[PDB]
Amino acid sequence: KDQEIKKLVDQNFKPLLEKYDVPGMAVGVIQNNKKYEMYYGLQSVQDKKAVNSNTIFELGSVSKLFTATAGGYAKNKGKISFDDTPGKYWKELKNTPIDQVNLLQLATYTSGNLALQFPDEVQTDQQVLTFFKDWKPKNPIGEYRQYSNPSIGLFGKVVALSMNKPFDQVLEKTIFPALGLKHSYVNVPKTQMQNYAFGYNQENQPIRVNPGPLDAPAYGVKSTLPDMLSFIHANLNPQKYPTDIQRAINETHQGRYQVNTMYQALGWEEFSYPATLQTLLDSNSEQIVMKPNKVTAISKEPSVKMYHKTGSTSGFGTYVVFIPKENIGLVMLTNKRIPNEERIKAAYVVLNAIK
Numbered sequence: 001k002d003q004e005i006k007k008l009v010d011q012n013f014k015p016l017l018e019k020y021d022v023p024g025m026a027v028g029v030i031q032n033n034k035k036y037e038m039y040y041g042l043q044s045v046q047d048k049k050a051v052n053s054n055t056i057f058e059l060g061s062v063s064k065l066f067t068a069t070a071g072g073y074a075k076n077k078g079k080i081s082f083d084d085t086p087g088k089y090w091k092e093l094k095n096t097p098i099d100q101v102n103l104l105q106l107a108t109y110t111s112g113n114l115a116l117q118f119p120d121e122v123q124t125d126q127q128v129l130t131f132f133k134d135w136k137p138k139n140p141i142g143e144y145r146q147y148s149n150p151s152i153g154l155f156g157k158v159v160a161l162s163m164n165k166p167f168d169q170v171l172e173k174t175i176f177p178a179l180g181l182k183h184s185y186v187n188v189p190k191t192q193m194q195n196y197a198f199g200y201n202q203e204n205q206p207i208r209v210n211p212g213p214l215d216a217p218a219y220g221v222k223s224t225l226p227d228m229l230s231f232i233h234a235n236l237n238p239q240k241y242p243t244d245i246q247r248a249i250n251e252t253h254q255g256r257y258q259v260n261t262m263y264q265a266l267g268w269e270e271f272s273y274p275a276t277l278q279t280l281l282d283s284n285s286e287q288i289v290m291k292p293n294k295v296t297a298i299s300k301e302p303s304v305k306m307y308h309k310t311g312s313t314s315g316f317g318t319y320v321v322f323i324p325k326e327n328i329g330l331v332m333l334t335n336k337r338i339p340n341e342e343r344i345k346a347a348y349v350v351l352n353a354i355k
């Protein structure tokens with residue numbers, strides 16, 4: 001039955017490469033503290049270079065899981081409180097309307113007036129500040145979820161301030177080493193550049209992620225399959241990790257509110273396990289991801305939880321899912337974006353099939 005993991009991944013993930021003309025894929029499963037790595041295709045088409053365990057992929061919004069973790073770590077070191085407001089850490093925002101939004105609300109997208117992206121004209125340090133100064137409320141604060149790069153991006157920048165280090169150094173010098181990660185970066189160094197995949201766009205042109213305002217906390221991490229698998233292992237089995245990072249991790253698992261069947265935890269999305277396929281699919285529906293939705297308090301506290309997160313940049317897809325009580329998880333990394341539904345559906349069949 002260990003011998004079936006490979007066959008399951010070939011049945012469910014492998015056809016997506018022909019169907020979506022994807023150059024390269026890495027799929028990892030972890031089960032009962034045993035890791036399985038499946039690699040497909042090429043990290044770079046023009047160089048005929050294979051996907052392998054050194055291959056670095058862009059994680060996109062799976063990056064928000066690291067930001068959430070950095071938030072949990074800073075809360076439990078007493079550097080921040082989730083009841084604080086950003087003006088306490090970014091002086092220049094004190095007494096402004098955005099300083100009525102607390103850090104949890106920023107992290108969990110409920111400021112009530114923040115869209116998916118910054119405006120394209122917002123780019124520099126000063127334009128970012130200016131944007132947050134000029135910010136004014138729209139929906140009642142804390143009542144409306146709209147998925148948002150600037151919201152969690154500011155939470156990220158506040159966490160770095162509370163730690164007196166820029167955000168990239170928070171991850172690379174504190175958070176990634178505490179998790180045992182060897183090849184995860186906000187900035188891929190010179191000596192690893194030959195391991196960094198090209199991404200491929202919808203016209204199969206090789207591309208990489210562009211700079212943008214507060215990109216690191218929102219979508220700027222790159223990692224390998226083994227690293228991601230270690231991250232899922234941390235999440236599934238955090239007793240082995242330093243106390244500090246354990247408390248951080250636990251903090252990311254606590255659901256804060258519900259949108260019907262989807263609970264919003266810190267970074268992660270949480271569901272009752274077992275979740276139906278449609279529950280997992282509808283979590284990244286146009287309605288949930290693209291438009292405001294009024295949240296409610298958690299009514300049904302799930303006893304057995306599962307967690308997932310999707311991520312995309314223009315050239316890369318990512319999906320990450322784990323279920324504590326089954327001691328199982330999966331990671332998919334592609335260097336071409338494929339529909340979220342496909343990633344979700346393939347992971348559902350594999351994880352169900354293994355028990």
Ligand SMILES: *[B@]([O])([C][N]S(=O)(=O)C1=[C][C]=C(C2=NN=N[N]2)[C]=[C]1)OP([O])([O])=O
Binds near residue numbers: 062116149210219289
């Ligand atoms: B995350 O992956 C955020 N998705 S996004 O639509 O906001 C997005 C951010 C950044 C890029 C990009 N910048 N430079 N190159 N590519 C593209 C898209 O959430 P998710 O999983 O997509 O819902």
